[PDB]
Swiss-Prot record, chain A:
It catalyses: a 2'-deoxyadenosine in DNA + S-adenosyl-L-methionine = an N(6)-methyl-2'-deoxyadenosine in DNA + S-adenosyl-L-homocysteine + H(+). Residues 1-158 are annotated as: N-terminal domain. The C-terminus is required for assembly of the restriction enzyme complex. The individual domains assume different positions in the enzyme, allowing the holoenzyme to regulate the methylase, endonuclease and translocation states. It is an enzyme of class 2 (transferase). The keyword Transferase applies. Its EC number is 2.1.1.72. S-adenosyl-L-methionine binds at residues 159-162, 189-191, 213. The type I restriction/modification system is composed of three polypeptides R, M and S; the restriction enzyme has stoichiometry R(2)M(2)S(1) while the methyltransferase is M(2)S(1). There is an equilibrium between R(2)M(2)S(1) and R(1)M(2)S(1); the latter is methylation and translocation proficient but restriction deficient. The gene is hsdM. The keyword Zinc-finger does not apply. It comes from the Bacteria. It comes from Escherichia coli. This is Type I restriction enzyme EcoR124I/EcoR124II methylase subunit. Belongs to the N(4)/N(6)-methyltransferase family. Type I restriction and modification enzymes are complex, multifunctional systems which require ATP, S-adenosyl methionine and Mg(2+) as cofactors and, in addition to their endonucleolytic and methylase activities, are potent DNA-dependent ATPases.
UniProtKB/Swiss-Prot annotation, chain C:
One of its GO terms (biological process) is DNA restriction-modification system. This is Type I restriction enzyme EcoR124I/EcoR124II specificity subunit. Keywords: DNA-binding, Plasmid, Restriction system. It comes from the Bacteria. It comes from Escherichia coli. Type I restriction and modification enzymes are complex, multifunctional systems which require ATP, S-adenosyl methionine and Mg(2+) as cofactors and, in addition to their endonucleolytic and methylase activities, are potent DNA-dependent ATPases. The presence or absence of a 4-amino acid repeat changes the sequence specificity; a third copy of TAEL inserted at position 179-180 changes the recognition site from 5'-GAAN(6)RTCG-3' (EcoR124I) to 5'-GAAN(7)RTCG-3' (EcoR124II). The shorter protein is also known as Type I specificity subunit S.EcoR124I. Disulfide bonds: none annotated. Contains two DNA recognition domains (TRD), each specifying recognition of one of the two defined components of the target sequence.
Curated annotation (Swiss-Prot), chain D:
Its EC number is 2.1.1.72. Residues 443-472 are annotated as: C-terminal tail. The C-terminus is required for assembly of the restriction enzyme complex. The individual domains assume different positions in the enzyme, allowing the holoenzyme to regulate the methylase, endonuclease and translocation states. It is an enzyme of class 2 (transferase). InterPro entries: D12N6_MeTrfase_N (IPR022749), DNA_Adenine_Mtase (IPR051537), DNA_methylase_A-5 (IPR003356), DNA_methylase_N6_adenine_CS (IPR002052), Restrct_endonuc_T1M (IPR004546), SAM-dependent_MTases_sf (IPR029063), T1MK-like_N_sf (IPR038333). The gene is hsdM. SUPFAM superfamilies: S-adenosyl-L-methionine-dependent methyltransferases. Signal peptide: none annotated. The type I restriction/modification system is composed of three polypeptides R, M and S; the restriction enzyme has stoichiometry R(2)M(2)S(1) while the methyltransferase is M(2)S(1). There is an equilibrium between R(2)M(2)S(1) and R(1)M(2)S(1); the latter is methylation and translocation proficient but restriction deficient. (Microbial infection) Holoenenzyme interacts with Escherichia phage T7 protein Ocr; this interaction leads to the inhibition of the restriction activity, but may still allow methylation and translocation. It comes from Escherichia coli. Residues 160-435 are annotated as: Catalytic domain. Gene3D superfamilies: 1.20.1260.30, Vaccinia Virus protein VP39. This is Type I restriction enzyme EcoR124I/EcoR124II methylase subunit. Pfam families: HsdM_N, N6_Mtase. It catalyses: a 2'-deoxyadenosine in DNA + S-adenosyl-L-methionine = an N(6)-methyl-2'-deoxyadenosine in DNA + S-adenosyl-L-homocysteine + H(+).
Length: 469, 163, 152, 472
């Protein structure tokens, strides 16, 4: 059962330290078991539950052409299980290095960098790895419900819950089967790009789900994240590092749909320590962003990499509010054309380790020609903890609002461009329609008034009788 | 305090190096008698300055006195932290627009003190029960105000650029 | 349909230095705080800041017929506090003050604020989801019925 | 104003990472800074900030006895911090061995567990040493608590025990009285012993005799607390701190039956018995009769505290207020403490007056210096329990608390001594007496009556004219 195996992970492997430290070891053993099962399944296309050391290079080049990981002859987890509980540790340290040799072609590697380790003594390390490999080995995993365990394990208590990601995907998708998708700037996890394949299992992949990300452990877990979902080798890769400093590919290409989840006010010192005034992505802004934010660098980066059907679904804290004349001319350059089209605000919290209401910007190089906001404060189904969830077809209600420019009361609507330039370029004061307004009738209140005054008066003269001194 | 080494474009290689320091207000004829002339008028070679801000290499002396009058216009605690405040802004008339919009905290020294001030003594929520007295996450409150509000950490306190 | 604030030159306030011990302890000008607010007809507040504190407070001197208003920390959620301030008293940038001018009745202005409180909360409503709250802008920019001086 | 500047430096050096590794930077740099002040000032007599092989370790063995090191003749804060791209890598874990081992004599091992030799990169590492220890090299005076930044680097999470100095001043001035004696001083279960710093560096010219044999669990906390006093000239030639757990290892058990001690017993001090070893039949829990349970073993510590005790010298401890007498599981314990006056006095405090508790504690002062009478000489407030910027020298109260603790000052709205048999007549008040008479008002019937009558009679015609105006 789904939650039963989730419960198995929630008890058995959770030992015996904080989960962020043994997380790497658990997911590495899980990933190794996955490659074991996948490679064993592939070589059957005749009873390799136990292998044979008959490695043919003219035949072993075909996984390197095809899956680009020849595991070994007989160094898989099914074959580790016999030699499980034996000397020694670093056979896995070898059996990381050997399948990661694989230079032919497009390595997508340097990758299993987890186990180092600590550990305090060598027999302790050996017993701990034996326990971890047995506990991963002692699971009931059938064959396709494998990434769901990764979805749960990454959803530890500590990350963008699945309905919000689904909302971003449906905002990214209508009327569209058009290579390519996707690019992601500052990808973080691939958990939001998971739903991209659930969309793209339907027709086909188009190009690689291109990301770039900063933190190297997050980079590795994201690469194995989109590896685990039966996603082909060829296209689907992430670049390491900042996108504000060195985005790549610059040349490749103007994109057609892009998503994001930028961090919270992470700083950057580049204005203008290099000539970022004279770049290709910050120059139509005219000014650069201050050091207390980064988000508009992402959005100008975004609209740089964008086609005629290019749309940009990005998220924000409300630091895009008005925030002054430079941020005005950001907003102005956005409303210079129909660059930004709709915005969507949500309600707090809906997010892990976070408070505030969030904002959803929709961008396109496509006519409207006005801003039609599509905003609620409730609902925003706030019953399951905490604003959770925007349920199935609750989001379809919001997408139906998004569909053709509707103007629903107690819900947002179109504004005039002349109104929003007459406004000082704000969000989302229009509309915010008037909840919980009540009034009553005179006669009930005044009859209650006069009767309670009569009760009060007879009680007052009775108190005067009770004034006994 | 606030003095410039400005002479001269005649013998452009800082030949005819004259005119040591000029505190404000600064006159054409005062510096001209300080330096003579370079047989023509090509002077105020801006090369060195004790100023609390960033000045340019060809700024005219009337603009220099203008900048100084804007400095002397501002309060002295802001004159001490012009370097920090101008990071958010770009000019001084720009700063003179929102010079009313600065919240000064000598009392608050980190973000924790900002949270404790705006919660406790401001009374932004009212009831502080003894069962709830400890239980106000000043850290997360400061994180959320840092996300929302423009804050600047300085020596003399914390300056909040509220609009 | 007089637009807001146009009836008389309403004020902003001004924040002193609390480390000025001469300008914080002595004197008798009532220093008005939003926790002194919430009441009604507060001629004098609890705090008694210095009469010489106007050297280093940047406040506004008020007559005996002023009204007060807050722009922080409780509105964006509720109805605004208001009190009739009746002495020469001073106040910071945490809140503001209104004096009307001659086209009015200052009690009618006071209760025009309090009366339209359910809608003048909405007038310049969000202007930031912080402790920072309702601006001056659409607190200046709404048409209210203001009759002639015989009818207030 | 100067500590404002030092405070801002303490804020700014926290950029960009926390003081777990900056522990090593601050302690090693400030340590050799103290060496280049003191030890090098011994060998000034005017030559070198840039110190060289002028030490003469054959004759400089005297600070290798007294300062317990020849630290670095050729590896100074100047002779290690210059450049980029040198050879070699490794200067921060292992092989400053001649100050770290330093066996001759009085060595006090795990002395230099911060930065010796290793080491990760070529001069990213050693130029990190160069640039960062040069930016710390010039952090001048602007010296008693010159590691106020270190009193804030250990207080980085503290803005669990990290020595609230007002409470520390309260214990040290409440170590008084009956104190000019020998020894000076003992401390069991010390932790961050800067309470010992304001207990003895304040009393330095007053009386200074013996070493401060603290005992804590966390070894890094142990070592930092050891060198903490030594930072600002509290000598560690022999005056030292022992490591371990205090009940499994109450060393020194032999030296001695102590006279004057203090402590702050923390939480996370519980342990399981009851007792499986011969601490079932030890010197202190067999007088207890019943023994310390798995959780409330705080009450063992006072049983430890009487184990190290004499009649004249008095002992101040504290406990979080889970002691009324805690039922029959601790009643006889309490009864043992009132078998005689083993406990002398108790004092209560105010919540918070700590780092986020927000509970009070109970100060228990123990001497076998009897009268005999039960003491409840407590005072919750005030004790201005806001912060440390009002009533900073005295609380207007430490002389008053001192006088109450001196001799039996029985002041109302404050509790006084009761009978020794009253605590066994009552069921062991700790502390209910006295808590005298707050907020008891009384008014005049006529004044409260006629004013209400007048304001009602205003209100009646207001109601009537309201009904008049309620007509449209």
């Amino acid at each position: 059962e789904l939650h039963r195996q989730i419960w198995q992970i929630a008890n058995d492997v959770r030992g015996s330290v904080d989960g962020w430290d043994f997380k790497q070891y658990v997911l590495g053993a899980l990933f190794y078991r996955f490659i074991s099962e996948n490679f064993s399944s592939y070589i059957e296309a005749t009873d390799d539950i136990k292998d044979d050391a008959i490695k043919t290079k003219g035949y072993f080049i075909y996984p390197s052409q095809l899956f680009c990981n020849v595991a070994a002859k007989a160094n898989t987890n099914d074959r580790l299980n016999a030699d499980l509980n034996s000397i020694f540790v670093a056979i896995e340290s070898s059996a990381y290095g050997y399948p990661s040799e694989a230079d032919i072609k497009g390595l997508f590697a340097d990758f299993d960098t987890t186990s180092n380790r600590l550990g305090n003594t060598v027999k302790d390390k050996n017993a701990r790895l034996a326990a971890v490999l047995k506990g991963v080995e002692g699971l009931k995993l059938g064959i396709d419900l494998f990434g769901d365990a990764y979805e749960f394990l990454i959803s530890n208590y500590a990350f963008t819950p699945q309905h919000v990601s689904k909302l971003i995907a449906q905002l990214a998708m209508h009327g569209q089967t058009h290579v390519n998708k996707i690019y992601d700037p500052a990808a973080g996890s691939g958990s939001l790009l998971l739903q991209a394949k659930k969309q793209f299992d339907n027709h086909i992949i188009e190009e690689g789900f291109f990301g770039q990300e900063i933190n190297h452990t997050t980079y590795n877990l994201a690469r194995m994240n989109m590896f685990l979902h039966n996603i082909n080798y060829d296209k689907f890769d992430i670049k390491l590092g900042n996108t504000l400093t060195e985005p790549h590919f610059r040349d490749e290409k103007p994109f057609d749909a892009i998503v994001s989840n930028p961090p919270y006010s992470v700083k950057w010192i580049g204005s203008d320590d290099p000539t970022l005034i004279n770049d290709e992505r910050f120059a139509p802004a005219g000014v650069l962003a201050p050091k207390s934010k980064a988000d508009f660098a992402f959005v100008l980066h975004a609209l740089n990499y964008l086609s005629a059907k290019g749309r940009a679904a990005i998220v924000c804290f409300p630091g895009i509010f008005y925030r002054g004349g430079a941020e005005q001319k950001i907003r102005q350059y956005l409303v210079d054309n129909n660059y930004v089209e709709t915005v969507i605000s949500l309600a707090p919290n809906l997010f892990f380790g976070t408070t505030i209401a969030v904002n959803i910007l929709v961008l396109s190089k496509h006519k409207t020609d006005t801003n039609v906001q599509f905003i609620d404060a409730s609902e925003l189904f706030k019953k399951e903890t905490n604003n959770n969830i925007l349920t199935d077809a609750h989001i379809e209600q919001i997408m139906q609002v998004f569909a053709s420019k509707e103007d629903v009361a107690h819900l947002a609507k179109s504004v005039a461009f002349e109104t929003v330039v007459a406004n000082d370029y704000n969000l989302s004061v229009s509309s915010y329609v008037e909840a919980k307004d009540n009034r009553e009738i005179i006669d009930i209140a005044e009859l209650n008034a006069e009767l309670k005054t009569t009760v009060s008066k007879i009680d007052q003269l009775r108190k005067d009788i009770d004034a006994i001194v | 305090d606030m003095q410039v080494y400005i002479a001269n474009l005649g013998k452009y290689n800082e030949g005819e190096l004259v005119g040591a320091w000029f505190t404000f207000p600064i006159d054409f004829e005062e510096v001209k008698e300080k330096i003579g002339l370079n047989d023509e008028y090509e002077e105020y070679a801006i090369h060195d300055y004790e100023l609390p801000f960033t000045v340019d290499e060809y700024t005219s002396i009337g603009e220099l006195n203008r900048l100084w009058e804007m400095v002397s216009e501002l309060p002295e605690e802001l004159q001490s932290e012009l370097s920090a405040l101008l990071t958010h802004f770009s000019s001084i008339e720009e700063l003179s627009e929102h010079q009313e919009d600065i919240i000064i905290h000598s009392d608050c020294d980190d973000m924790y003190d900002v949270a404790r001030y705006y919660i406790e003594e401001t009374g932004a929520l009212g009831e502080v029960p003894a069962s709830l007295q400890n239980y106000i996450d000043y850290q997360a409150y400061g994180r959320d105000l840092d996300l929302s509000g423009t804050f600047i950490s300085t020596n003399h306190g914390i300056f909040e650029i509220v609009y | 349909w007089k637009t807001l604030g146009e009836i008389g030159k309403w004020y902003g306030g001004g924040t002193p230095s609390k480390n000025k011990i001469e300008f914080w302890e002595n004197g008798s000008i009532p220093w008005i705080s939003p926790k002194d607010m919430g009441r009604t007809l507060v001629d004098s507040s609890e705090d008694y800041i210095t009469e010489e504190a106007v050297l280093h407070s940047s406040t506004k001197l008020i007559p005996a017929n002023s009204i007060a208003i807050v722009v922080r920390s409780s509105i964006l959620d509720k109805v605004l506090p208001s009190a009739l301030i009746k002495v020469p008293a001073t106040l910071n940038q945490d809140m503001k003050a209104v004096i009307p001018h001659e086209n009015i009745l200052v009690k009618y202005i006071y209760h025009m604020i309090g009366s339209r409180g359910s809608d003048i909360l909405r007038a310049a409503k969000k202007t930031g989801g912080s402790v920072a709250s309702i601006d001056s802008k659409k607190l200046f920019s709404f048409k209210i019925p203001v009759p002639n001086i015989n009818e207030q």
